[PDB]
Amino acid sequence: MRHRKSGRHLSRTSAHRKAMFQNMAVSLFEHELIKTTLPKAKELRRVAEPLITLAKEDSVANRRLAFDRTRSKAAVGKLFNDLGKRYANRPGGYLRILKCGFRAGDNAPMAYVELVDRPV
Amino acid sequence: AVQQNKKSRSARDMRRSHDALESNALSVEKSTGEVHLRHHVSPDGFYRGRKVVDK
Amino acid sequence: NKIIQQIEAEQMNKEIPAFAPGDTVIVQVKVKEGDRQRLQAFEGVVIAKRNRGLNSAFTVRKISNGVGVERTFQTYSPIVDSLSVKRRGDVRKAKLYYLRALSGKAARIKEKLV
Amino acid sequence: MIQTQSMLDVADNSGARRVMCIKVLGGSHRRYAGIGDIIKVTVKEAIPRGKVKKGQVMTAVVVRTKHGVRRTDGSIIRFDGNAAVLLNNKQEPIGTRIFGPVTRELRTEKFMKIVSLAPEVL
Amino acid sequence: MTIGVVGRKCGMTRIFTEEGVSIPVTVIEVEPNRVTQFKTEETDGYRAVQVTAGERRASRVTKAQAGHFAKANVAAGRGVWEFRLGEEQYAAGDQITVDLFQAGQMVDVTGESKGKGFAGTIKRWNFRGQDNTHGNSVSHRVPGSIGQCQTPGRVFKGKKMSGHLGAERVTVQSLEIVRVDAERNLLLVKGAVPGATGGDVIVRPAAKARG
RNA sequence: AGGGGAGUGAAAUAGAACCUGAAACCGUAUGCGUACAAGCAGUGGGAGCCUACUUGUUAGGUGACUGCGUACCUUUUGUAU
RNA sequence: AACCCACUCCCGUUGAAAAGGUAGGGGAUGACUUGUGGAUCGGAGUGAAAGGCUAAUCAAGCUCGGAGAUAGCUGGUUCUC
RNA sequence: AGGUGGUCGGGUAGAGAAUACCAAGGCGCUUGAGAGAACUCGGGUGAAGGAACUAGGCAAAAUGGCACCGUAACUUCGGG
RNA sequence: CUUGUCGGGUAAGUUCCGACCUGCACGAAUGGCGUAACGAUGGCGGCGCUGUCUCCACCCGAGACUCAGUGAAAUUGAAA
RNA sequence: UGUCGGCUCAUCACAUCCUGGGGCUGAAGCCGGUCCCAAGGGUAUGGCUGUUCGCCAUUUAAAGUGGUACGCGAGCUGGGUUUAGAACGUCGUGAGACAGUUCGGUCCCUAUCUGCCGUGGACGUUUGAGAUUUGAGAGGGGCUGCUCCUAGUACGAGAGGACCGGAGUGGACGAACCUCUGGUGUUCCGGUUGUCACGCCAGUGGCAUUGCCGGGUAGCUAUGUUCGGAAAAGAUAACCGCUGAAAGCAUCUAAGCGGGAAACUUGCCUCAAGAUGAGAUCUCACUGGGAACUUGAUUCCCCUGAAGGGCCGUCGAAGACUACGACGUUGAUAGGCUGGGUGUGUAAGCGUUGUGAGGCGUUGAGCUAACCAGUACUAAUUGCCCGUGAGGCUUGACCA
Ligand SMILES: [Mg+2]
Ligand SMILES: [Mg+2]
Ligand SMILES: [Mg+2]
Ligand SMILES: [Mg+2]
Ligand SMILES: [Mg+2]
Ligand SMILES: [Mg+2]
Ligand SMILES: [Mg+2]
Ligand SMILES: [Mg+2]
Ligand SMILES: [Mg+2]
Ligand SMILES: [Mg+2]
Ligand SMILES: [Mg+2]
Ligand SMILES: [Mg+2]
Ligand SMILES: [Mg+2]
Ligand SMILES: [Mg+2]
Ligand SMILES: [Mg+2]
Ligand SMILES: [Mg+2]
Ligand SMILES: [Mg+2]
Ligand SMILES: [Mg+2]
Ligand SMILES: [Mg+2]
Ligand SMILES: [Mg+2]
Ligand SMILES: [Mg+2]
Ligand SMILES: [Mg+2]
Ligand SMILES: [Mg+2]
Ligand SMILES: [Mg+2]
Ligand SMILES: [Mg+2]
Ligand SMILES: [Mg+2]
Ligand SMILES: [Mg+2]
Ligand SMILES: [Mg+2]
Ligand SMILES: [Mg+2]
Ligand SMILES: [Mg+2]
Ligand SMILES: [Mg+2]
Ligand SMILES: [Mg+2]
Ligand SMILES: [Mg+2]
Ligand SMILES: [Mg+2]
Ligand SMILES: [Mg+2]
Ligand SMILES: [Mg+2]
Ligand SMILES: [Mg+2]
Ligand SMILES: [Mg+2]
Ligand SMILES: [Mg+2]
Ligand SMILES: [Mg+2]
Ligand SMILES: [Mg+2]
Ligand SMILES: [Mg+2]
Ligand SMILES: [Mg+2]
Ligand SMILES: [Mg+2]
Ligand SMILES: [Mg+2]
Ligand SMILES: [Mg+2]
Ligand SMILES: [Mg+2]
Ligand SMILES: [Mg+2]
Ligand SMILES: [Mg+2]
Ligand SMILES: [Mg+2]
Ligand SMILES: [Mg+2]
Ligand SMILES: [Mg+2]
Ligand SMILES: [Mg+2]
Ligand SMILES: [Mg+2]
Ligand SMILES: [Mg+2]
Ligand SMILES: [Mg+2]
Ligand SMILES: [Mg+2]
Ligand SMILES: [Mg+2]
Ligand SMILES: [Mg+2]
Ligand SMILES: [Mg+2]
Ligand SMILES: [Mg+2]
Ligand SMILES: [Mg+2]
Ligand SMILES: [Mg+2]
Ligand SMILES: [Mg+2]
Ligand SMILES: [Mg+2]
Ligand SMILES: [Mg+2]
Ligand SMILES: [Mg+2]
Ligand SMILES: [Mg+2]
Ligand SMILES: [Mg+2]
Ligand SMILES: [Mg+2]
Ligand SMILES: [Mg+2]
Ligand SMILES: [Mg+2]
Ligand SMILES: [Mg+2]
Ligand SMILES: [Mg+2]
Ligand SMILES: [Mg+2]
Ligand SMILES: [Mg+2]
Ligand SMILES: [Mg+2]
Ligand SMILES: [Mg+2]
Ligand SMILES: [Mg+2]
Ligand SMILES: [Mg+2]
Ligand SMILES: [Mg+2]
Ligand SMILES: [Mg+2]
Ligand SMILES: [Mg+2]
Ligand SMILES: [Mg+2]
Ligand SMILES: [Mg+2]
Ligand SMILES: [Mg+2]
Ligand SMILES: [Mg+2]
Ligand SMILES: [Mg+2]
Ligand SMILES: [Mg+2]
Ligand SMILES: [Mg+2]
Ligand SMILES: [Mg+2]
Ligand SMILES: [Mg+2]
Ligand SMILES: [Mg+2]
Ligand SMILES: [Mg+2]
Ligand SMILES: [Mg+2]
Ligand SMILES: [Mg+2]
Ligand SMILES: [Mg+2]
Ligand SMILES: [Mg+2]
Ligand SMILES: [Mg+2]
Ligand SMILES: [Mg+2]
Ligand SMILES: [Mg+2]
Ligand SMILES: [Mg+2]
Ligand SMILES: [Mg+2]
Ligand SMILES: [Mg+2]
Ligand SMILES: [Mg+2]
Ligand SMILES: [Mg+2]
Ligand SMILES: [Mg+2]
Ligand SMILES: [Mg+2]
Ligand SMILES: [Mg+2]
Ligand SMILES: [Mg+2]
Ligand SMILES: [Mg+2]
Ligand SMILES: [Mg+2]
Ligand SMILES: [Mg+2]
Ligand SMILES: [Mg+2]
Ligand SMILES: [Mg+2]
Ligand SMILES: [Mg+2]
Ligand SMILES: [Mg+2]
Ligand SMILES: [Mg+2]
Ligand SMILES: [Mg+2]
Ligand SMILES: [Mg+2]
Ligand SMILES: [Mg+2]
Ligand SMILES: [Mg+2]
Ligand SMILES: [Mg+2]
Ligand SMILES: [Mg+2]
Ligand SMILES: [Mg+2]
Ligand SMILES: [Mg+2]
Ligand SMILES: [Mg+2]
Ligand SMILES: [Mg+2]
Ligand SMILES: [Mg+2]
Ligand SMILES: [Mg+2]
Ligand SMILES: [Mg+2]
Ligand SMILES: [Mg+2]
Ligand SMILES: [Mg+2]
Ligand SMILES: [Mg+2]
Ligand SMILES: [Mg+2]
Ligand SMILES: [Mg+2]
Ligand SMILES: [Mg+2]
Ligand SMILES: [Mg+2]
Ligand SMILES: [Mg+2]
Ligand SMILES: [Mg+2]
Ligand SMILES: [Mg+2]
Ligand SMILES: [Mg+2]
Ligand SMILES: [Mg+2]
Ligand SMILES: [Mg+2]
Ligand SMILES: [Mg+2]
Ligand SMILES: [Mg+2]
Ligand SMILES: [Mg+2]
Ligand SMILES: [Mg+2]
Ligand SMILES: [Mg+2]
Ligand SMILES: [Mg+2]
Ligand SMILES: [Mg+2]
Ligand SMILES: [Mg+2]
Ligand SMILES: [Mg+2]
Ligand SMILES: [Mg+2]
Ligand SMILES: [Mg+2]
Ligand SMILES: [Mg+2]
Ligand SMILES: [Mg+2]
Ligand SMILES: [Mg+2]
Ligand SMILES: [Mg+2]
Ligand SMILES: [Mg+2]
Ligand SMILES: [Mg+2]
Ligand SMILES: [Mg+2]
Ligand SMILES: [Mg+2]
Ligand SMILES: [Mg+2]
Ligand SMILES: [Mg+2]
Ligand SMILES: [Mg+2]
Ligand SMILES: [Mg+2]
Ligand SMILES: [Mg+2]
Ligand SMILES: [Mg+2]
Ligand SMILES: [Mg+2]
Ligand SMILES: [Mg+2]
Ligand SMILES: [Mg+2]
Ligand SMILES: [Mg+2]
Ligand SMILES: [Mg+2]
């Protein structure tokens, strides 16, 4: 049974699931548009979106908290300087998911994840 | 465990009466007339009258 | 769950002072041994607590006549007539279940003076 | 809850130190004995000049359990060990003193004698 | 029996009596039921009343159901139910609230039990497991034997096997009404009610009663 | 890769895995039958429908319904076994 | 510990493997383990002895000959009246 | 997932060529994606009992280091 | 014959230990009777420990299930 | 055609062990003995032994007897027995033997068909559709102790001790549930060992079985909580009758009228019109033309496709895939956000005290999964496909 439970296993251990979403969020902040499998994109918004919320208030304790959850110095600086000021007046919903077909190799459903207000 | 008699031609064709394939939901973009999967970005990179990825 | 909250909120009128795990408390328990109604005292250290509104509870532990006994009280039950803190304890944990394996002088709780 | 092969100490002064449950009485296929339940025990250790011997089969009442007993308001009382009181053929205690506290579920007509002798009744 | 109300299961709580007793209680919210149709002997055979409760948005109501709901000026709700009444009179548009019940008043509650997906014989039928050691080979929770040798030489119909502990319709009998709330439209019933929070339940007077 | 034309040839459905090209086996098209019915699948009877021409005492294809009906070989006193 | 071995459970049994794996186990300066080269063989060899081993073959190896051994025993034996 | 002789063999802990985390160097084991039923395999925790299991404590749980104190019957006087 | 009989151990012991002698059918280098140390050796009994069990519950990975690709096996007189 | 015993799961008979109804008794009562009716439901745990049995210990209302390949190894085991090793007694010159002992000794198979447990697709139910239904039929369930009152009454010299009727509380079994008591909770919070890294200090992160641990939310769950077995009606069994002749009496029977059991039919719960005998009720939708005939339940073309269904998407205490349930901008379906709740237990930085480890303050701080409430910030498109165009004929009765 699974009643009222959140979270996908994705056929990994809990430690390897955590490392993978840590990597995915770092890539998303750096490139602002990435392509991945649809189930992975839906579990990613429960990790990346709370990090953008935390960067709205800039302080030493917040930046350390962001670094503990993204062990990346470039990601901590992209937050707190660009993301967090761009979404200061945005009440959630910072990333958007769009289905984009299937892979040729294994017929896996794919999706686009991008930030809502990319400068371009 | 294995069969004691071989299946007839008719018997195995009845098992395959559920093997048929269904079709997909296709839509046409009003701006360009291009066919795409319903609720999916088109192969040219459009969705709901907007350019999303531009290849 | 919004209307269960209102049904439970009408049954919570007792005073219920503030205490913490590790405190030494005295609980007056209502006993009816027939028609006569008296109060009994239960003195011991609070080893656990449970904050759930109407379903709140706390467990206290004592040594009666060379035998350890511990009772879990329902906080808003009418059987709990009153409660008072005798001493305050200085502990780091929320549940003091390690006191079950300690017996005499090793089971003492430091006192929180202020 | 007490079942066969459970060891429990003696809250009486009848000379026994440890007894083992060998039967839970009062029903076919009955599994557990709680506080106030009559059981059949064998004496495992005894005092040199007690009034019971080692290897003697007799009847006891369970007086104190680690599983505990629940009250009508939802509360529960637990103890740090299992204890029993040995009884004779007419179902009265064999000793003359009772050590440790007991509970109010024991205030029945047939066990009211041992309630009075108990230092504390919880 | 023969008449009841439809409600939603809100959850469980306690009532503390003044003498210090805790009563386990299930809270049932009964929105006031509305009479949609009345069936009599001469025009349907049997004799019953058809009822609805709740609300349903207009885009989700069909034209066949809108016309049925409009013969009685009664408005559309979620679901429709009948109660097989013995000798009672009701007219289209009538209301039925918690006011047909009192404190005391043993009642029957019917619901749809929680669904376990596909259960084994140990959980579904309370079979007993085999050895976990002493040489057992990949057969710890398996059902064992299912028949005999050449005589009959088949499995008997109704044999207990595995699959789908149901989300079925079950009835719990002789439950005591602790509190009737007419202003909040609440029924407080002692004990457990089948189903999950938010499910549909039917409350009827107890069929056995007597004792 | 493989094909559709065009050409060569008496002939490419003689195209190089190349004379002829059977059977098992696998398909596409058309006609009739088949979703309340129990078994060696056939046979005696038999309506209806389709096709052809001599327009029905005819030929071809299907076979609703119904009576009977437990494969072949070997070995045996004896086999649906 | 390495290295040599193979006591127990489980898995695997159409195996990853025609004898393994994980987890535990024994010996581990000696009657030890191991590389290279050499010697002994078919009624023969070798054997701290189990009828063990002698190229996944052993109460007498493999290969080719006598040789189409012999088989009072099973099986099969082909068109018509 | 087997077998195959010899040589080299760093750091921090450590008695160590054990073990753990790393260096130089090498690799992610040539089908993937999902979902999170029974059941099978390999594991974690478990109320109250504590061998009642079973042919049998099989399996599991448990013990586990260094220093010091202390240690029985028996003995071939080494031992135990 | 036989679970001989007596004693001990257990609430209860066809196994175990100590004896008796009626040895179906022990017996002295196919050695008799003892024996410290040793044994992945056989039998019995304790302490600790426990999912072995009462009686199973939850959780974690690998399969099983679905989708895409590749693609076996034993078996088989014919089957409405 | 795998042969004992154990485990798991059973199904039937009645020659009945308990519970139910009776006759006789060498039946005072409480207990019994024997026979008749009755198969609804029940019907031990252990010590020894490979044992089935048996004997013991302690229970129980009771610990039934048998059939089913002495039920059940393509469900498990492998202690016994019946391969190969070794030993004892006995027999044989010996190789060896014993239905005599003793220690050791590999249990294969991915389910085609029938069967069974679940869950779907197609078609039909005579125009189609949304919804609610009757009940032919079938399954489930059905056990029982003790205590008290009648009443220390009937009975009995006493000891002792009821029938009938009423109330309470248990055991075993089953269902549902998670408020409480607990378990779990590798998705929440802390402590800590070794090592590597983030330039370094501080602070953190990876790996070590989740490294080892201490707690714990939702969900799931029992050992926790609640409920159940009925009462009652009918037709009967054995049995007990009423009236009553054949046969002036007698006689339950021949005519007629009764009482009567956990068995049978209902009553309680669940499924149920594929019940092809395909039932019923409420409401909704569709009201254009030609052509050819082999001239009516016919075929073809143009036009027009409603009620509704599905595809698709966001999901679900629903789920193997399905199916089922809610929603799709006229929107709270999912995520986020904002509040709260819950858990953990006083973060970082700074300031003080100390030589330092550490302490103290800011500070019940910081963080917080699945929970509660609100909010369109993100994602649920602006679409396609099925489904048609008034529903045959005969007979009868009412209307026109
Ligand atoms: Mg959810
Ligand atoms: Mg996978
Ligand atoms: Mg890890
Ligand atoms: Mg097969
Ligand atoms: Mg077959
Ligand atoms: Mg065959
Ligand atoms: Mg065969
Ligand atoms: Mg055959
Ligand atoms: Mg198929
Ligand atoms: Mg479910
Ligand atoms: Mg259950
Ligand atoms: Mg069992
Ligand atoms: Mg078991
Ligand atoms: Mg095996
Ligand atoms: Mg296993
Ligand atoms: Mg048959
Ligand atoms: Mg069954
Ligand atoms: Mg030409
Ligand atoms: Mg040709
Ligand atoms: Mg040619
Ligand atoms: Mg030629
Ligand atoms: Mg050719
Ligand atoms: Mg051919
Ligand atoms: Mg075909
Ligand atoms: Mg037909
Ligand atoms: Mg029929
Ligand atoms: Mg058939
Ligand atoms: Mg004919
Ligand atoms: Mg013809
Ligand atoms: Mg015919
Ligand atoms: Mg025929
Ligand atoms: Mg026939
Ligand atoms: Mg016939
Ligand atoms: Mg033959
Ligand atoms: Mg023969
Ligand atoms: Mg013969
Ligand atoms: Mg003969
Ligand atoms: Mg014949
Ligand atoms: Mg045959
Ligand atoms: Mg060897
Ligand atoms: Mg192991
Ligand atoms: Mg090993
Ligand atoms: Mg060596
Ligand atoms: Mg040496
Ligand atoms: Mg040497
Ligand atoms: Mg050696
Ligand atoms: Mg050498
Ligand atoms: Mg050589
Ligand atoms: Mg040679
Ligand atoms: Mg030779
Ligand atoms: Mg030789
Ligand atoms: Mg030899
Ligand atoms: Mg030899
Ligand atoms: Mg030999
Ligand atoms: Mg060779
Ligand atoms: Mg060889
Ligand atoms: Mg020879
Ligand atoms: Mg010759
Ligand atoms: Mg020959
Ligand atoms: Mg021969
Ligand atoms: Mg002969
Ligand atoms: Mg033959
Ligand atoms: Mg032959
Ligand atoms: Mg080697
Ligand atoms: Mg090193
Ligand atoms: Mg070592
Ligand atoms: Mg390693
Ligand atoms: Mg590394
Ligand atoms: Mg490197
Ligand atoms: Mg691979
Ligand atoms: Mg497991
Ligand atoms: Mg395991
Ligand atoms: Mg494990
Ligand atoms: Mg464990
Ligand atoms: Mg835990
Ligand atoms: Mg435990
Ligand atoms: Mg414990
Ligand atoms: Mg113990
Ligand atoms: Mg035992
Ligand atoms: Mg046993
Ligand atoms: Mg066993
Ligand atoms: Mg062991
Ligand atoms: Mg264990
Ligand atoms: Mg282990
Ligand atoms: Mg271990
Ligand atoms: Mg010793
Ligand atoms: Mg003997
Ligand atoms: Mg003897
Ligand atoms: Mg004896
Ligand atoms: Mg034993
Ligand atoms: Mg013994
Ligand atoms: Mg002896
Ligand atoms: Mg003798
Ligand atoms: Mg001898
Ligand atoms: Mg001599
Ligand atoms: Mg001799
Ligand atoms: Mg000797
Ligand atoms: Mg040795
Ligand atoms: Mg040896
Ligand atoms: Mg020994
Ligand atoms: Mg024993
Ligand atoms: Mg489980
Ligand atoms: Mg799993
Ligand atoms: Mg595929
Ligand atoms: Mg596939
Ligand atoms: Mg029968
Ligand atoms: Mg009878
Ligand atoms: Mg009987
Ligand atoms: Mg009688
Ligand atoms: Mg008789
Ligand atoms: Mg019976
Ligand atoms: Mg029976
Ligand atoms: Mg029966
Ligand atoms: Mg019957
Ligand atoms: Mg009945
Ligand atoms: Mg037993
Ligand atoms: Mg035994
Ligand atoms: Mg009894
Ligand atoms: Mg039987
Ligand atoms: Mg048998
Ligand atoms: Mg039997
Ligand atoms: Mg087996
Ligand atoms: Mg067997
Ligand atoms: Mg097997
Ligand atoms: Mg079988
Ligand atoms: Mg079979
Ligand atoms: Mg098997
Ligand atoms: Mg054996
Ligand atoms: Mg031998
Ligand atoms: Mg001799
Ligand atoms: Mg061995
Ligand atoms: Mg068949
Ligand atoms: Mg069949
Ligand atoms: Mg039927
Ligand atoms: Mg039944
Ligand atoms: Mg029934
Ligand atoms: Mg019973
Ligand atoms: Mg709970
Ligand atoms: Mg826990
Ligand atoms: Mg550390
Ligand atoms: Mg560094
Ligand atoms: Mg550093
Ligand atoms: Mg600090
Ligand atoms: Mg540092
Ligand atoms: Mg660290
Ligand atoms: Mg690392
Ligand atoms: Mg590692
Ligand atoms: Mg590493
Ligand atoms: Mg450890
Ligand atoms: Mg933990
Ligand atoms: Mg907890
Ligand atoms: Mg919980
Ligand atoms: Mg009756
Ligand atoms: Mg007369
Ligand atoms: Mg008469
Ligand atoms: Mg008559
Ligand atoms: Mg009657
Ligand atoms: Mg009854
Ligand atoms: Mg009856
Ligand atoms: Mg129908
Ligand atoms: Mg039918
Ligand atoms: Mg109908
Ligand atoms: Mg429409
Ligand atoms: Mg639609
Ligand atoms: Mg889904
Ligand atoms: Mg709104
Ligand atoms: Mg949301
Ligand atoms: Mg918030
Ligand atoms: Mg809190
Ligand atoms: Mg502080
Ligand atoms: Mg601080
Ligand atoms: Mg920290
Ligand atoms: Mg403070
Ligand atoms: Mg807090």
Bridge partner residues of E12 (DSSP): E26
State how beta strands B35-37 and C24-32 pair: unpaired
What are the residues whose beta carbons fall under 8 Å from the beta carbon of E49, sequence distance 6 or more?
Answer: E3, E35, E37, E38, E39, E82, E83, E85, E88, E90
Query: CA E187 to CA A108: how far, in whole Å?
Result: 51
- Residue E113: phi, psi to the nearest 5? -65, 160
How is residue E17 written in tokens?
Answer: 């009596």
Helix locations, chain C, DSSP H: 2-9
Q: Work out the end-to-end distance of chain A between its first and last CA atoms, rounded to an integer number of angstroms.
A: 46
Tokens 């360009």 locate to B32
**Best CA proximity match to E10, nearest among E202, E201, E198:** E198
How is residue E72 written in tokens?
Answer: 């009685």
* Residues E123 and E129: beta-carbon distance below 8 Å: no
What are the residues whose beta carbons fall under 8 Å from the beta carbon of E132, sequence distance 6 or more?
Answer: E140
Nucleotide I77's nearest residue (CA vs C1') is B5
Q: Find the A89 Cα to ligand 38 centroid distance in Å.
A: 95
- Residue E78: phi, psi to the nearest 5? -75, 130
Helix (H) or strand (E) holding D96, with range, is none
Return the CA Rg of chain A. Answer: 15
Bridge partner residues of D69 (DSSP): D77
Query: CA D119 to CA E77: how far, in whole Å?
Result: 66
What's the distance, CA A28 to chain centroid?
6
Between CA E2 and CA E10, with CA E4 as vertex, the angle to 5 degrees is: 150
How is residue B4 written in tokens?
Answer: 């004691």
Which 3 state secondary structure label does DSSP give C2? Answer: helix
Tokens 């709780």 locate to C109
**Contact flag for B and E (3+ C-beta pairs < 8 Å):** no
State how beta strands C37-50 and D57-64 pair: unpaired
Query: CA E118 to CA E162: how far, in whole Å?
Result: 7
* Residues A44 and A25: beta-carbon distance below 8 Å: yes
Under DSSP, the state recorded for C91 is -
The letter for the amino acid at B22 is: E
How is residue B35 written in tokens?
Answer: 């066919």
What's the distance, CA A106 to chain centroid?
24
Return the CA Rg of chain C. Answer: 16
* Residues B40 and B34: beta-carbon distance below 8 Å: no
Nucleotide J327's nearest residue (CA vs C1') is E60
How is residue A106 written in tokens?
Answer: 């294994």
**Best CA proximity match to A113, nearest among A52, A29, A56:** A29
The letter for the amino acid at E6 is: V
Which 3 state secondary structure label does DSSP give D121? Answer: strand
What are the residues whose beta carbons fall under 8 Å from the beta carbon of E138, sequence distance 6 or more?
Answer: none
* Residues E190 and E180: beta-carbon distance below 8 Å: no
J53 C1' to E127 CA distance, Å: 29
D→E interface, C-beta within 8 Å: 72-74
* Residues E47 and E84: beta-carbon distance below 8 Å: yes
D74 near C CB under 8 A:
yes
Which 3 state secondary structure label does DSSP give D15? Answer: coil
CB contact under 8 A, E20 and D72: yes
State how beta strands E33-39 and E95-96 pair: antiparallel
- Asked whether residue E165, judged by its CB, lies under 7 Å from any atom of the DNA or RNA strand J, the reply is yes
Nucleotides in F strand less than 7 A from protein CB: 25-27
Query: CA E172 to CA D69: how far, in whole Å?
Result: 28
Which 3 state secondary structure label does DSSP give A64? Answer: helix
What are the residues whose beta carbons fall under 8 Å from the beta carbon of D37, sequence distance 6 or more?
Answer: D2, D24, D25, D26, D61, D62
How is residue E55 written in tokens?
Answer: 């609300």
Q: Give the CA-trace dihedral at E185, E191, E194, E199, to 10 degrees.
A: 20
Helix (H) or strand (E) holding D31, with range, is none
How is residue D60 written in tokens?
Answer: 């006891």
**Best CA proximity match to D4, nearest among D24, D18, D34, D27:** D24
J5 C1' to E154 CA distance, Å: 26
A100 near B CB under 8 A:
yes
Query: CA C23 to CA C88: how far, in whole Å?
Result: 5
- Asked whether residue E138, judged by its CB, lies under 7 Å from any atom of the DNA or RNA strand G, the reply is yes
Find, in chain E, the residue whose alpha carbon is nearest to that of C12: E16
Query: CA E38 to CA E85: how far, in whole Å?
Result: 10
Query: CA E141 to CA E129: how far, in whole Å?
Result: 5
How is residue B55 written in tokens?
Answer: 């290849």
Bridge partner residues of D64 (DSSP): D83
Return the CA Rg of chain E. Answer: 23
C→D interface, C-beta within 8 Å: 31, 33, 64-74, 77-79, 100
Tokens 């429709």 locate to E80
Within 8 A of D74 by CB-CB distance, chain E residues are 14, 22
Chains that touch E (3 or more CB pairs under 8 A): A, C, D
How is residue C24 written in tokens?
Answer: 């030494």
CB contact under 8 A, D74 and E22: yes
The letter for the amino acid at A75 is: A
How is residue C20 written in tokens?
Answer: 């913490």
Helix (H) or strand (E) holding B37, with range, is strand B35-37
What's the distance, CA E165 to chain centroid?
16
* Residues E96 and E51: beta-carbon distance below 8 Å: yes
Q: Which experimental method was this entry solved with?
A: cryo-EM
- Residue C3: phi, psi to the nearest 5? -90, -20
Which 3 state secondary structure label does DSSP give E38? Answer: strand
Could you tell me the sign of the dihedral formed by the alpha carbons of A30, A35, A36, A40, in that order? positive
- Asked whether residue B9, judged by its CB, lies under 7 Å from any atom of the DNA or RNA strand F, the reply is yes
* Residues E141 and E127: beta-carbon distance below 8 Å: no
CA distances in angstroms from E83 to D32, E186, E198, listed in the order given: 46, 20, 21
The letter for the amino acid at C36 is: R
Q: Work out the end-to-end distance of chain C between its first and last CA atoms, rounded to an integer number of angstroms.
A: 40
H70 C1' to C101 CA distance, Å: 28
What's the distance, CA C100 to chain centroid?
16
How is residue D67 written in tokens?
Answer: 């599983």
Q: How many Cα atoms sit within 13 Å of E175 on the Cβ side?
A: 28
Residue E162, CA: closest nucleotide via C1'? J117
**Best CA proximity match to D63, nearest among D5, D117, D4:** D117
Nucleotide J320's nearest residue (CA vs C1') is E118
Q: Give the CA-trace dihedral at E68, E70, E72, E78, to 10 degrees.
A: 70
A60 near E CB under 8 A:
no
CB contact under 8 A, C79 and D77: no
Tokens 């009847």 locate to D59
Chains that touch C (3 or more CB pairs under 8 A): D, E
Inter-chain contacts counted by CB atoms under 8 A, chains A and E: 3
CA distances in angstroms from D90 to D59, D110, E158, listed in the order given: 10, 10, 52
State how beta strands D83-87 and E169-181 pair: unpaired
Helix locations, E51-172, DSSP H: 63-71, 121-125
The letter for the amino acid at D89 is: N
Query: CA A33 to CA A21: how far, in whole Å?
Result: 15
CB contact under 8 A, E20 and D74: no
Bridge partner residues of E150 (DSSP): none
Residue of E10, E179, E180 to mutate for C, most C C-beta atoms under 10 A: E10
Bridge partner residues of D61 (DSSP): D38, D85
State how beta strands E48-53 and E169-181 pair: unpaired
Q: Find the D84 Cα to ligand 19 centroid distance in Å.
A: 106
State how beta strands C57-63 and C37-50 pair: antiparallel
How is residue E62 written in tokens?
Answer: 């069909």
State how beta strands C57-63 and C68-74 pair: antiparallel
Query: CA C21 to CA C45: how far, in whole Å?
Result: 8
Q: How many Cα atoms sit within 13 Å of A8 on the Cβ side?
A: 14
Q: Work out the end-to-end distance of chain E between its first and last CA atoms, rounded to an integer number of angstroms.
A: 16
Between CA D29 and CA D36, with CA D34 as vertex, the angle to 5 degrees is: 115
Query: CA A49 to CA D35: how far, in whole Å?
Result: 56
The letter for the amino acid at E209 is: A
Tokens 């840590």 locate to A22
Residue D37, CA: closest nucleotide via C1'? J170
What are the residues whose beta carbons fall under 8 Å from the beta carbon of E182, sequence distance 6 or more?
Answer: E97, E98, E99
Query: CA E37 to CA E93: how far, in whole Å?
Result: 8
* Residues B54 and B47: beta-carbon distance below 8 Å: no
Helix (H) or strand (E) holding A77, with range, is helix A73-78
A61 near E CB under 8 A:
no
How is residue A108 written in tokens?
Answer: 């896996």
Query: CA C50 to CA C57: how far, in whole Å?
Result: 5
